[PDB]
Amino acid sequence: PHSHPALTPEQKKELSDIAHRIVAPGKGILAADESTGSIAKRLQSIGTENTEENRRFYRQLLLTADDRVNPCIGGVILFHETLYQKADDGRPFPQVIKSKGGVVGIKVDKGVVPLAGTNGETTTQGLDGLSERCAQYKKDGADFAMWRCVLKIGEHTPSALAIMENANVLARYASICQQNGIVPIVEPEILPDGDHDLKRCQYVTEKVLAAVYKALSDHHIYLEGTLLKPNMVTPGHACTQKYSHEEIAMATVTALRRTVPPAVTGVTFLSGGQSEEEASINLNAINKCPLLKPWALTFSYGRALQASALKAWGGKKENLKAAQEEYVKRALANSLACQGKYTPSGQAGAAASESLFISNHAY
Amino acid sequence: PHSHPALTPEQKKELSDIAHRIVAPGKGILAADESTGSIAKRLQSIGTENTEENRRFYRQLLLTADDRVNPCIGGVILFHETLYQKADDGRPFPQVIKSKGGVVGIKVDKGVVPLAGTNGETTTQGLDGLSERCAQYKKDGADFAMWRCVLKIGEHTPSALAIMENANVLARYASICQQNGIVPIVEPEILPDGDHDLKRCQYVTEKVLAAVYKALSDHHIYLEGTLLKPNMVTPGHACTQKYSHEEIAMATVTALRRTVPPAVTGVTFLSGGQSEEEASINLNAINKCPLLKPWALTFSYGRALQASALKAWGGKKENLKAAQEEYVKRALANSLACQGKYTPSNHAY
Amino acid sequence: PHSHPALTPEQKKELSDIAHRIVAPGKGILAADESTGSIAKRLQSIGTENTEENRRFYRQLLLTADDRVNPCIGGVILFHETLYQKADDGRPFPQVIKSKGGVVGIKVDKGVVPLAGTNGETTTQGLDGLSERCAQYKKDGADFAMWRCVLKIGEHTPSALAIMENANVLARYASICQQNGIVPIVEPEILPDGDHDLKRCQYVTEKVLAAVYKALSDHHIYLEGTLLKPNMVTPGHACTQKYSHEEIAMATVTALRRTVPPAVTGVTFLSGGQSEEEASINLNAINKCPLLKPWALTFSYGRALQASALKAWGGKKENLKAAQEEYVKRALANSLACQGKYTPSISNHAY
Amino acid sequence: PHSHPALTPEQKKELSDIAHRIVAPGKGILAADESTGSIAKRLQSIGTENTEENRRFYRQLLLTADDRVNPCIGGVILFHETLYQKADDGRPFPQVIKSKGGVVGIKVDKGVVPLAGTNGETTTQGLDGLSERCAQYKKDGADFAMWRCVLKIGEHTPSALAIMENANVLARYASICQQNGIVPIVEPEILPDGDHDLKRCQYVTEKVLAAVYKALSDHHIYLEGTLLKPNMVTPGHACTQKYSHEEIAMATVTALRRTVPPAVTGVTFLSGGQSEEEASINLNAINKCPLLKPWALTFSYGRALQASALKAWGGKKENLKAAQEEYVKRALANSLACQGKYTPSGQASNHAY
C-alpha cells in the first residue's frame, strides 16, 4: 500500500523514449537473434555449414541492406555472438544498426526448461547474473532486450502452473531490465501447434495475457517502458476449419483490447511459423480492424523476414545482392502492413508463400 | 485451458449496447440511489422528515426535470424503493426515465461488512439471491446495476486481503448481473480520507484496479458489457500539499491507462465528496488530458449533481422549479465536462 | 506484515474448547441438518408425507435415543427449522442434545449457485447477514456451524476458478463464524461422481485442501477453532478399477498429512453416499492407517447414520423403538470406527 | 485437475529415505557451507588468512572430529569448493562424512538480489543450469541441497511481492532438486533484525510459511522428500520487551503447527545469530513444548556449532585438538536438545499465541 519508486522520472523517460522509437509509425523489428543451434537448422536448409564466419556473413547481409529498409526497421534483435561481431569494414554490428536509424536489441534468456509435474510444459531460465549482463549490454550498444516463454494449447495445457510461473519469470526479467536502462520486450508465445480452432486460441491468449499484466503489476513494471511480443490469434496449424484474414485480425485485436493496458507502448507480433506473405497480410488486416487500438501494432519477425533471403543467398557470397533484395522486399511490405497500407501484387515467389511452421520451435 | 461460453453472441450484444448507450458522447449518470439511511443526513440538513413521500417527491423532482437534461443523462441509478414508485401523474419512475432517453439502473449491494483481522477494512455483501433479484429488476425496467466496494488509504491499508476480497466479490456480482441481461457497473472506491498525497493515491488506485481486472478475467467477465466507477486520483482530504486540476487529471488518466483494458466500454467517475464545481472542473481536465484514452470518461454523480438542488428544495413543494433548475445546471455542466468543453513531463507520474 | 488481532485470547479459548469437545476421543457428529427439499425424497421412499410434524417426529426420534449414543455423539447438526422445534416433553431440541452431552450445530449456507463460464460448476451462497444470524443462533444454543461447498471431478473440473472461489467463500464464512463464538466446520466436498480412479481423487483432494488452507490463512482464520469436513479419498462411484479399504485409508490419510496443518483440531468425514457399513469400515481403516495423524479423525455422517433408522421407522409411530435401535447401532459402530476398534464381526510411496 | 506424476514411486522412496536419515532421532545438521566471502569475516576475526588451504584445514577439523559426533550429525552441508577437497589421508570429504554416518549436502543458491520497487527487499537467484548442477552433485556424493531466501520485518516488509516471489523461487528450486534425486531443504529465513516483538515475528512467520507451502503445492513438490529450515520465532534484536525460552518455544511450535503439513519430514532450525548456548536451550525448549509436533524438530546450525571451535583454533595447527573439542561439545549438546534431553549439566497459556 506504500510506493517505493522502482524508477526515477529520468529513468522512465529514457525507457519510454526507447520503446517509442522502436515502434515508430511504419517501423518494425528484425529478429535475427537465433542461437547457433537454431540458426544451424536454417543454414542446413541451404547446404551452408554452420560456422562462425557463415553466421557473421549472413547477419552482415541483413544488417547492411540498402537504405530503403531504414524507415522500415525500428529495431534489430541480435544473439550474444552477433552483438560482438563486425562487418567487413570493421564496424561493430551495433554501430551498423544505429547508423541506419535502428535501435539495438539483445536476447537474454537462456532457453526453456521442463516444469516437473506437467504434461510437457516449460518455463524459461536466464535470470542469474542478468543485472550485470544488462549493464554490460547497455554499455555495448543495446537499448532493449528479448526473453521468450513458450506455452502450448492442448487438453490440459496451458496449465495453471505454467501460466503463473511463466508470467512471473517474465515479470522478473522485465524488472531487472528496467533497472539497467533496457526496454524489455515481453514474449509469452502460445504455439500454433495443434488442431484447436480460432476461438480456442483467442480464449487461451486472453487468459495468458491477463496473467502476464497482473504479474507485471505485482512486480512494479513500468508498462510505457515495455513492449509486448505476442502470438497473433489464429487457429491451430492442424485445424480443419478455415478462417479469413479479417477474422484472424478481429480475434487478435479483440483479445488484446481485453487484456493489454493502453499504457503499453506497442505490440510487436511474432510470425510464429506463418509464411512471409501470410504474416504481412495478417498484420495488415490487424491494422485495418475497425476496433480502437491504443497501441502501435507492428512486427518483430524472425522467419517471416528471412525466408526468401536465406533461399536467395544459398550460402554463395555471389548471391549477396539477390539475397539482400528479398529481405528488403519483405521489410517494405511489413512496413506498409503495420500501417494498413499493404496489398500484395504477385511478386515474391513460392519462397514467400511456403509455410515456415516448425513443431516446438526453439531459438 | 478450455472455454465454456458464459454468454451467447446475443447476450453479449445486448450488454454491449446497453453499456454504450449509458456513456454515449456527452452523457453521464445521475446517481439517485441513496437508501433511507444514507439520505437521512441530507434531509436532516434541510429540516425535512425522512418519509417515503418526501423521498418520492424529491426523486420525482429530479427525474421530471425539464428536457434540457435529456442529452446530459444517459442513465439514472435508483434505490429499490424508488424503482417501484410513481410520479403524481401515475407514470412509474422507470417509465419517466426512459421517456427522457435514459437507461434505468438499480443499486443491488447490501452495504459493507467488517473484515476480521484488518484495521477497520471492509468487503461488501449482497450476493445471496442476487440472480433472482436481477431477473426481477430486469423485468421491471432496469438494464444496469450498481455495487459499491470501499477501500481506505492508511498506514497498513488497503491490505492484500482487502484488495483481493473486494476484487473477487465485485467479479461475482459482475458475473451474476451479466447472466441476467444487466450491465454491471464495477465500483472499487478508494476513499479520499487521510493526509496522503497524489502519488500515494495514484499508486494505490493502480494496484486496486489491476487486482479488479485480474479478478474480472478469472471470473470470465465480458468487459465490453461493463462500466468502471472509480474514484478520480486525488490527494487525501487532509493533505497539506496542493495540486492543480491538470495534475489530478494527469494522475487519474495515467492510472487508468496502466490498468483498464481498452475493451471496457466506459469509466463513470464517482464525485466522492468533491463539490459540484470541483467535480465538474476535474472531469473536464481529465477529458482535456493530452494522453490517449480508449474509453469514455464521464460521470456517475450522486452528491455532485444534487447539492444545490436539495438546498433549493428545502423540502418545500413551492421550491420545485427552483430546485430542478439547480440540478439542470449541474447536468449541463458535467455534460460539457465529459467532453472537455466546460469552463469553471508525464514521466513524473 | 502487520497483525490486527481478529480474536482475543478469551475468544480463542472458547472456540478451541468447543472444537475439542465435538471431536473428543470416540465421538463424532450426527448430521440431521437436511432441509425440506433434501429430506423430501428421503421421507418419500418410505411413503411418509413431508410435513412439519413428521420431520419433527423423525428428528425427535434420533435426538432422544437412549444414553448409549451419548459417548458416540460429540455434536449434532440441525437445520434452522429443527433448532426451534420441541420434543413431546416441551423441551427445545437444542436442550435435548446438550443434556445428552452433545454440542449443538446449525447449517448456515444457502445452497449452491452456478458459476457462469464453467462446465456446471458451483460456488455457495449465504454470507449476507450471516453475522447477525450467527449471533442469534449462538444465543439460541448453537456453538458450531456447517457450510457446504461442492466440487466435481470431470474432464475439465474442478477448474481453477471453482477451487479459488469455493476456498474463498469458505474462508469468509469461517471468519464471520469465529467473530460470533461459533466454531466453523469447513466443508469442501469433492463429489464421488464419475469414473475417475483413486489416484485422481487423491490428487484433486490434495489441490483443493491446499487452496482451502491458504485461503483460511489469507483471511486470518484461527485453525484451532475450526474443524474440517472433507470427502474421504475414494475411487469414483463408477470407477471400473476396484480398491481395498486399506488403499482408501492410505490415500485419505496421505492427502490429509500433505495439506492439513496440525493446528486443525479435527477432521469429520462426510459419508458421501457410502453405505452405512462401508462408511464405518473405511473410517476404521483410516484410523488404523500406519501413518501419523496429528488430528482426530472422526465422522460427520448424515445418510450413513440414518439409512436403517429411516427404513425401520417407515413413518409409523409404533416403530419408534425399532428405528432408534438401528440408529444406535450405527452410532456405536462409528464410535468404535473413529478409534480403529471397529470390527463387523507398507510402500506408501505409491501414493 | 489432472495429475502428471513428477516422480515415480522409486524416486519418492529415495527422497523420503534420505530426508528421514538426515533428521533421525538425536541427529541434526552441521552447516559448514560458508562461501569464501562469508567465511572471510570469520577468519580475520581469528587472525587467519583466507586461503583455500586454510579453509580446507578448518573444514577438515570439523569433519574429522572423533566418533562422538556420529550419532549427533545426520547431515553436513558443504560449499562447492569443499565438496571436492580431500582430507590429509587423501579421502574425499564426502567420503569422510559418509563413513561417519552422515549424509552430504550442498548449497546451490547464488545469493540474494534486490527486488526493484521494494524497501530494500530481495529474492534469490541460482536456478540457471541448476538441473545439470544437481545431477553432477548427486553423482559426486551429495544427497540434499540448501537454498536461502531472506525476508525482513520492517514498517512495510515483508511485502506481498517479496513473500510471493521468494516462495515461488523456493518451489522452483525444490522441483529441480527432486527431479535429480536431491532432497531440497527449503530455507525462508526471516531475519531477527529490528525492534519488533514476539507476536510480530510469529505473525510474519505464519504468513510466510503458509505462502511457502501453497507454492510447493502449486509446483507439485513431494513434501515427504523435503525438509524445512526456518528461523525460530523470537523477538527482534532491538526489542525492549523480554521473553523466556518457553515463550519462544511456544510461539515457534504454534507457528509451525498452523502452517507446516505433517507430511514434511523434518524442521531444521537455523541459529540466526543466537549464541551457541542460546540456540541449544531454545531448541531444547522447543522439543519440550507440550503441543503435538508431527515432524522432527532438530538443528541445521552454522555459527551455533562453530563459534567456539573457530576461536579455539585461532588458525594454529597446535590448537586442532582443542578446536575440535569445542565443536564436539556443541554437537553433543544440540543432539540432546533435538530430543528435549538437554540440561546445563553434563549429559545428565496457549491461547495467548
PDB file of C-alpha atoms in Angstrom, chain C residues 166-285:
ATOM      1  CA  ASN C 166     -15.098 -22.016  -3.139  1.00  0.00           C
ATOM      2  CA  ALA C 167     -11.955 -21.786  -0.989  1.00  0.00           C
ATOM      3  CA  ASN C 168     -12.526 -18.049  -0.638  1.00  0.00           C
ATOM      4  CA  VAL C 169     -16.190 -18.213   0.379  1.00  0.00           C
ATOM      5  CA  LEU C 170     -15.423 -20.892   2.991  1.00  0.00           C
ATOM      6  CA  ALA C 171     -12.855 -18.502   4.449  1.00  0.00           C
ATOM      7  CA  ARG C 172     -15.387 -15.652   4.577  1.00  0.00           C
ATOM      8  CA  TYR C 173     -17.876 -17.945   6.300  1.00  0.00           C
ATOM      9  CA  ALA C 174     -15.246 -19.144   8.800  1.00  0.00           C
ATOM     10  CA  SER C 175     -14.234 -15.555   9.593  1.00  0.00           C
ATOM     11  CA  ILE C 176     -17.791 -14.451  10.321  1.00  0.00           C
ATOM     12  CA  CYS C 177     -18.497 -17.521  12.451  1.00  0.00           C
ATOM     13  CA  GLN C 178     -15.435 -17.084  14.666  1.00  0.00           C
ATOM     14  CA  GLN C 179     -16.359 -13.439  15.283  1.00  0.00           C
ATOM     15  CA  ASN C 180     -19.556 -14.705  16.891  1.00  0.00           C
ATOM     16  CA  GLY C 181     -18.238 -17.516  19.078  1.00  0.00           C
ATOM     17  CA  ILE C 182     -19.316 -20.181  16.586  1.00  0.00           C
ATOM     18  CA  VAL C 183     -16.855 -22.905  15.542  1.00  0.00           C
ATOM     19  CA  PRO C 184     -16.942 -23.171  11.739  1.00  0.00           C
ATOM     20  CA  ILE C 185     -16.786 -26.636  10.207  1.00  0.00           C
ATOM     21  CA  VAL C 186     -15.305 -26.147   6.742  1.00  0.00           C
ATOM     22  CA  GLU C 187     -16.798 -28.494   4.154  1.00  0.00           C
ATOM     23  CA  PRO C 188     -15.113 -28.540   0.732  1.00  0.00           C
ATOM     24  CA  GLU C 189     -16.844 -31.663  -0.585  1.00  0.00           C
ATOM     25  CA  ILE C 190     -15.424 -33.277  -3.700  1.00  0.00           C
ATOM     26  CA  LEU C 191     -18.224 -35.495  -5.080  1.00  0.00           C
ATOM     27  CA  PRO C 192     -17.538 -39.199  -5.814  1.00  0.00           C
ATOM     28  CA  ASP C 193     -19.452 -38.826  -9.098  1.00  0.00           C
ATOM     29  CA  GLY C 194     -17.634 -40.151 -12.159  1.00  0.00           C
ATOM     30  CA  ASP C 195     -15.347 -42.954 -13.307  1.00  0.00           C
ATOM     31  CA  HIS C 196     -12.059 -41.427 -12.102  1.00  0.00           C
ATOM     32  CA  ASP C 197      -9.712 -43.632 -10.063  1.00  0.00           C
ATOM     33  CA  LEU C 198      -8.265 -43.405  -6.542  1.00  0.00           C
ATOM     34  CA  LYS C 199      -5.099 -41.520  -7.553  1.00  0.00           C
ATOM     35  CA  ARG C 200      -7.166 -38.893  -9.371  1.00  0.00           C
ATOM     36  CA  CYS C 201      -9.343 -38.279  -6.313  1.00  0.00           C
ATOM     37  CA  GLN C 202      -6.241 -38.026  -4.118  1.00  0.00           C
ATOM     38  CA  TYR C 203      -4.661 -35.501  -6.481  1.00  0.00           C
ATOM     39  CA  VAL C 204      -7.754 -33.287  -6.626  1.00  0.00           C
ATOM     40  CA  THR C 205      -8.298 -33.590  -2.847  1.00  0.00           C
ATOM     41  CA  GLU C 206      -4.702 -32.521  -2.194  1.00  0.00           C
ATOM     42  CA  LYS C 207      -5.026 -29.489  -4.503  1.00  0.00           C
ATOM     43  CA  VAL C 208      -8.392 -28.435  -3.083  1.00  0.00           C
ATOM     44  CA  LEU C 209      -7.261 -28.710   0.532  1.00  0.00           C
ATOM     45  CA  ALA C 210      -4.073 -26.733  -0.198  1.00  0.00           C
ATOM     46  CA  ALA C 211      -6.223 -23.985  -1.691  1.00  0.00           C
ATOM     47  CA  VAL C 212      -8.599 -24.120   1.259  1.00  0.00           C
ATOM     48  CA  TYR C 213      -5.901 -23.670   3.880  1.00  0.00           C
ATOM     49  CA  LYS C 214      -4.107 -20.908   2.018  1.00  0.00           C
ATOM     50  CA  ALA C 215      -7.465 -19.093   1.895  1.00  0.00           C
ATOM     51  CA  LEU C 216      -8.047 -19.632   5.615  1.00  0.00           C
ATOM     52  CA  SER C 217      -4.597 -18.124   6.249  1.00  0.00           C
ATOM     53  CA  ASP C 218      -5.227 -15.136   3.975  1.00  0.00           C
ATOM     54  CA  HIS C 219      -8.439 -14.463   5.926  1.00  0.00           C
ATOM     55  CA  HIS C 220      -6.738 -14.769   9.357  1.00  0.00           C
ATOM     56  CA  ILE C 221      -8.693 -17.873  10.416  1.00  0.00           C
ATOM     57  CA  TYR C 222      -7.896 -19.393  13.824  1.00  0.00           C
ATOM     58  CA  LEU C 223      -7.426 -23.067  12.847  1.00  0.00           C
ATOM     59  CA  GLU C 224      -7.574 -24.443  16.387  1.00  0.00           C
ATOM     60  CA  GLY C 225     -11.104 -23.053  16.434  1.00  0.00           C
ATOM     61  CA  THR C 226     -12.241 -24.914  13.309  1.00  0.00           C
ATOM     62  CA  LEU C 227     -12.937 -28.429  12.070  1.00  0.00           C
ATOM     63  CA  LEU C 228     -12.618 -29.905   8.583  1.00  0.00           C
ATOM     64  CA  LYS C 229     -15.375 -31.951   6.920  1.00  0.00           C
ATOM     65  CA  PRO C 230     -13.882 -33.455   3.752  1.00  0.00           C
ATOM     66  CA  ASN C 231     -14.676 -36.345   1.446  1.00  0.00           C
ATOM     67  CA  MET C 232     -12.624 -39.466   2.098  1.00  0.00           C
ATOM     68  CA  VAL C 233     -10.287 -40.209  -0.798  1.00  0.00           C
ATOM     69  CA  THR C 234     -12.004 -42.934  -2.825  1.00  0.00           C
ATOM     70  CA  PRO C 235     -12.276 -44.039  -6.443  1.00  0.00           C
ATOM     71  CA  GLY C 236     -15.134 -42.568  -8.437  1.00  0.00           C
ATOM     72  CA  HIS C 237     -18.572 -44.070  -7.860  1.00  0.00           C
ATOM     73  CA  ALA C 238     -18.408 -45.582 -11.374  1.00  0.00           C
ATOM     74  CA  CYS C 239     -14.706 -46.471 -11.448  1.00  0.00           C
ATOM     75  CA  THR C 240     -14.002 -49.814 -13.156  1.00  0.00           C
ATOM     76  CA  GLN C 241     -10.821 -50.373 -11.163  1.00  0.00           C
ATOM     77  CA  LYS C 242     -11.511 -51.663  -7.646  1.00  0.00           C
ATOM     78  CA  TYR C 243      -9.662 -50.884  -4.420  1.00  0.00           C
ATOM     79  CA  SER C 244      -9.455 -52.165  -0.852  1.00  0.00           C
ATOM     80  CA  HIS C 245     -10.374 -50.320   2.343  1.00  0.00           C
ATOM     81  CA  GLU C 246      -6.681 -50.157   3.248  1.00  0.00           C
ATOM     82  CA  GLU C 247      -5.944 -48.448  -0.058  1.00  0.00           C
ATOM     83  CA  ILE C 248      -8.720 -45.930   0.503  1.00  0.00           C
ATOM     84  CA  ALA C 249      -7.413 -45.295   4.022  1.00  0.00           C
ATOM     85  CA  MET C 250      -3.827 -44.819   2.830  1.00  0.00           C
ATOM     86  CA  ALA C 251      -4.822 -42.382   0.083  1.00  0.00           C
ATOM     87  CA  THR C 252      -7.054 -40.467   2.502  1.00  0.00           C
ATOM     88  CA  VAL C 253      -4.514 -40.137   5.317  1.00  0.00           C
ATOM     89  CA  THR C 254      -1.732 -39.279   2.882  1.00  0.00           C
ATOM     90  CA  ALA C 255      -3.783 -36.482   1.290  1.00  0.00           C
ATOM     91  CA  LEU C 256      -4.570 -35.035   4.715  1.00  0.00           C
ATOM     92  CA  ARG C 257      -0.978 -35.239   6.008  1.00  0.00           C
ATOM     93  CA  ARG C 258       0.162 -33.267   2.939  1.00  0.00           C
ATOM     94  CA  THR C 259      -2.349 -30.431   3.329  1.00  0.00           C
ATOM     95  CA  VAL C 260      -3.973 -30.113   6.764  1.00  0.00           C
ATOM     96  CA  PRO C 261      -1.944 -28.175   9.353  1.00  0.00           C
ATOM     97  CA  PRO C 262      -1.530 -29.950  12.746  1.00  0.00           C
ATOM     98  CA  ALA C 263      -3.298 -26.948  14.309  1.00  0.00           C
ATOM     99  CA  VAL C 264      -6.642 -28.093  12.892  1.00  0.00           C
ATOM    100  CA  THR C 265      -8.476 -29.663  15.835  1.00  0.00           C
ATOM    101  CA  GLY C 266     -10.278 -32.388  13.930  1.00  0.00           C
ATOM    102  CA  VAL C 267     -11.421 -33.931  10.670  1.00  0.00           C
ATOM    103  CA  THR C 268     -15.068 -35.046  10.484  1.00  0.00           C
ATOM    104  CA  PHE C 269     -15.561 -37.124   7.323  1.00  0.00           C
ATOM    105  CA  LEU C 270     -18.792 -36.898   5.348  1.00  0.00           C
ATOM    106  CA  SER C 271     -20.323 -40.247   4.280  1.00  0.00           C
ATOM    107  CA  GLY C 272     -20.929 -39.006   0.725  1.00  0.00           C
ATOM    108  CA  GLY C 273     -23.339 -41.691  -0.438  1.00  0.00           C
ATOM    109  CA  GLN C 274     -21.424 -44.608   1.061  1.00  0.00           C
ATOM    110  CA  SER C 275     -23.491 -47.370   2.674  1.00  0.00           C
ATOM    111  CA  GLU C 276     -23.648 -47.389   6.478  1.00  0.00           C
ATOM    112  CA  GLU C 277     -21.269 -50.350   6.693  1.00  0.00           C
ATOM    113  CA  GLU C 278     -18.806 -49.026   4.116  1.00  0.00           C
ATOM    114  CA  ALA C 279     -18.668 -45.622   5.808  1.00  0.00           C
ATOM    115  CA  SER C 280     -17.832 -47.301   9.117  1.00  0.00           C
ATOM    116  CA  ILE C 281     -15.316 -49.784   7.695  1.00  0.00           C
ATOM    117  CA  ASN C 282     -13.463 -47.047   5.815  1.00  0.00           C
ATOM    118  CA  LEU C 283     -13.359 -44.755   8.860  1.00  0.00           C
ATOM    119  CA  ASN C 284     -11.937 -47.685  10.824  1.00  0.00           C
ATOM    120  CA  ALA C 285      -9.275 -48.316   8.164  1.00  0.00           C
TER     121      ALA C 285
END
